[PDB]
Amino acid sequence: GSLTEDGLSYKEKFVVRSYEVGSNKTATVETIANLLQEVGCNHAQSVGFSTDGFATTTTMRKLHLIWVTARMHIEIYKYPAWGDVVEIETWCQSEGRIGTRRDWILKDSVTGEVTGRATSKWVMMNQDTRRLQKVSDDVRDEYLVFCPQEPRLAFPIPKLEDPAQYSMIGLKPRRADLDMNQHVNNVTYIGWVLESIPQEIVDTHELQVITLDYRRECQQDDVVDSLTTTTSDSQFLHLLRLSGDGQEINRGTTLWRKKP
Amino acid sequence: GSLTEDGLSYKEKFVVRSYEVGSNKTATVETIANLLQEVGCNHAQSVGFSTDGFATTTTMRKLHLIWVTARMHIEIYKYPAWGDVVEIETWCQSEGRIGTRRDWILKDSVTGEVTGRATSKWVMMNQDTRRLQKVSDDVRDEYLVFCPQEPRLAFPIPKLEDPAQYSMIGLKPRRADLDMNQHVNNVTYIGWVLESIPQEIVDTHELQVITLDYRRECQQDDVVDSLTTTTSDSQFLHLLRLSGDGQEINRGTTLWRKK
Numbered sequence: 001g002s003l004t005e006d007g008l009s010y011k012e013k014f015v016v017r018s019y020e021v022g023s024n025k026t027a028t029v030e031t032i033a034n035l036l037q038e039v040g041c042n043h044a045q046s047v048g049f050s051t052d053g054f055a056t057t058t059t060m061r062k063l064h065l066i067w068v069t070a071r072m073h074i075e076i077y078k079y080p081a082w083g084d085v086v087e088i089e090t091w092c093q094s095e096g097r098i099g100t101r102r103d104w105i106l107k108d109s110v111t112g113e114v115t116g117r118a119t120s121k122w123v124m125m126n127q128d129t130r131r132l133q134k135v136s137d138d139v140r141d142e143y144l145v146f147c148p149q150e151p152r153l154a155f156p157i158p159k160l161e162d163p164a165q166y167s168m169i170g171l172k173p174r175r176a177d178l179d180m181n182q183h184v185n186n187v188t189y190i191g192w193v194l195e196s197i198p199q200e201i202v203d204t205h206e207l208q209v210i211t212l213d214y215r216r217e218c219q220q221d222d223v224v225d226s227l228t229t230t231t232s233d234s235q236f237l238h239l240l241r242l243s244g245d246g247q248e249i250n251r252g253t254t255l256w257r258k259k260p
Numbered sequence: 261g262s263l264t265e266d267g268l269s270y271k272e273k274f275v276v277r278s279y280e281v282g283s284n285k286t287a288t289v290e291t292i293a294n295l296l297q298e299v300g301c302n303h304a305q306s307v308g309f310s311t312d313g314f315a316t317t318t319t320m321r322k323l324h325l326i327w328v329t330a331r332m333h334i335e336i337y338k339y340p341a342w343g344d345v346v347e348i349e350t351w352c353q354s355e356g357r358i359g360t361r362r363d364w365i366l367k368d369s370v371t372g373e374v375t376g377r378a379t380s381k382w383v384m385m386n387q388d389t390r391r392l393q394k395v396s397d398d399v400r401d402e403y404l405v406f407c408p409q410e411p412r413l414a415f416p417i418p419k420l421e422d423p424a425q426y427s428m429i430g431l432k433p434r435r436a437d438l439d440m441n442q443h444v445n446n447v448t449y450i451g452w453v454l455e456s457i458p459q460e461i462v463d464t465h466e467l468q469v470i471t472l473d474y475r476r477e478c479q480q481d482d483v484v485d486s487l488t489t490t491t492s493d494s495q496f497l498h499l500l501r502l503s504g505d506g507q508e509i510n511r512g513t514t515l516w517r518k519k
């Protein structure tokens with residue numbers, strides 16, 4: 001893939017692999033999430049940013065500062081099939097002092113149609129303390145030249161109450177869930193959320209919308225419980241929290257549609 | 261990718277993705293294993309076989325016969341970095357009535373240097389009974405025209421004894437570990453085997469050789485314990501078995517080099 005003509009977004013193509021699809025012979029939402037993240041890293045790299053802390057600038061690397069996801073919103077109209085070519089376009093936009101925002105459009109490359117959209121909200125925090133920080137003029141000066149200045153939107157949560165309707169308890173990060181900087185991969189949260197969805201609902205529906213609000217990061221030795229209640233098509237409320245009624249990790253919602 | 265000019269091997273290039281590497285900033289052995297499997301399905305697809313039961317022929321699908329892995333042997337000289345282009349060549353070879361073999365060669369597509377080698381033995385078994393069958397004439401006829409006929413080798417285990425030195429217990433297949441027809445991905449076993457390797461050894465060594473004997477498949481609702489004992493660079497003996505001192509899933513060995 002590469003930067004577009006104007007140098008303000010990034011495009012990449014992927015052939016959906018055999019291991020990347022589940023029952024429906026289409027890409028899982030974990031595959032989609034991974035490709036969104038891959039095209040992100042490729043955009044960051046192409047303009048000279050580091051993946052450690054997700055597009056670290058100079059004054060950032062200097063201050064041990066990183067971006068982490070406050071929120072991920074993914075909506076899939078159609079999941080690409082095994083052997084299909086999907087095209088993903090991504091860009092980043094400033095959100096003043098709140099933080100930054102990365103957006104994605106997924107297309108069937110063969111046919112040009114929009115098959116998916118994503119948006120994410122990122123905030124600056126300290127790498128060592130894990131403490132959040134607003135965007136100063138000096139850090140915005142370093143990235144603003146890589147972002148469209150005019151708005152460009154891909155898209156122009158309650159705490160779950162005890163008792164949960166459904167649970168998957170004692171979820172542990174495995175070594176393959178850890179990235180190059182030994183951090184639990186964001187795509188893991190999506191899988192842990194869906195693990196508490198009853199097998200029958202996965203078997204007869206497709207995920208159309210997921211929203212995740214990230215509260216704190218799971219470490220490598222942590223153990224997580226995934227809690228789902230029906231709120232409704234089929235709609236669900238989600239909570240990830242540390243084993244032993246520990247702290248909230250994530251909350252989220254999903255919307256599923258019946259298979260054809 | 262595509263078949264080679266003689267039509268008897270298959271070649272595919274992969275660009276190593278960010279999420280495919282761990283700490284060393286090189287592709288994990290799991291990523292390697294996944295790319296081996298993918299060039300495998302692409303090969304089976306290229307010559308008209310079904311990916312379900314890992315390259316089934318017409319007679320096989322008729323008789324409810326699939327290929328299962330008996331053994332997987334992988335050696336890595338060098339793990340490709342984030343951004344590197346690896347090229348994998350793969351071919352299959354008849355082992356008469358016992359089954360078939362698939363071999364791979366990995367290459368830095370820039371230097372054309374051999375960065376790794378894999379070999380696998382696959383046996384024929386009835387989907388339903390899980391009973392092993394020797395390969396008939398009618399099934400061999402259907403695939404032998406797609407295999408080199410002269411030998412082509414990419415490479416020219418005891419039961420672990422209680423107590424285990426290291427263990428990781430209660431390992432469960434997650435939804436993402438299951439393939440398109442609800443089978444636990446063979447590559448899952450590699451990850452589980454390595455989960456009982458202590459972190460300090462993974463931080464200070466890279467894996468050079470792994471060998472796995474597959475005894476039976478883990479189902480979606482199964483729970484597995486990963487047991488490892490040092491036998492030695494560092495060598496290990498491994499055992500996956502179902503929780504509750506259940507049946508053996510896998511045995512294997514790993515050899516690790518210092519960084």
Ligand SMILES: COC1=C(c2ccccc2F)C(=O)N(C(C)(C)C(=O)Nc2cccc(Cl)c2)C1
Nearest residue numbers: 037040041044054055067092100102122143146
């Ligand atoms: C440097 O400033 C940032 C950019 C950026 C701006 C212009 C050009 C290139 C950029 F990376 C960016 O995308 N940032 C956020 C945190 C929103 C991000 O999504 N990072 C990110 C990195 C890797 C992977 C993924 Cl999935 C996300 C910060």
Ligand SMILES: COC1=C(c2ccccc2F)C(=O)N(C(C)(C)C(=O)Nc2cccc(Cl)c2)C1
Nearest residue numbers: 297300301304314315327352360361362382406
């Ligand atoms: C059809 O007969 C078989 C071939 C075959 C022979 C010639 C041309 C193409 C082929 F697929 C083959 O490779 N077979 C075994 C079981 C050894 C295999 O590796 N399958 C396999 C499929 C997908 C992925 C993976 Cl990781 C492995 C059986």
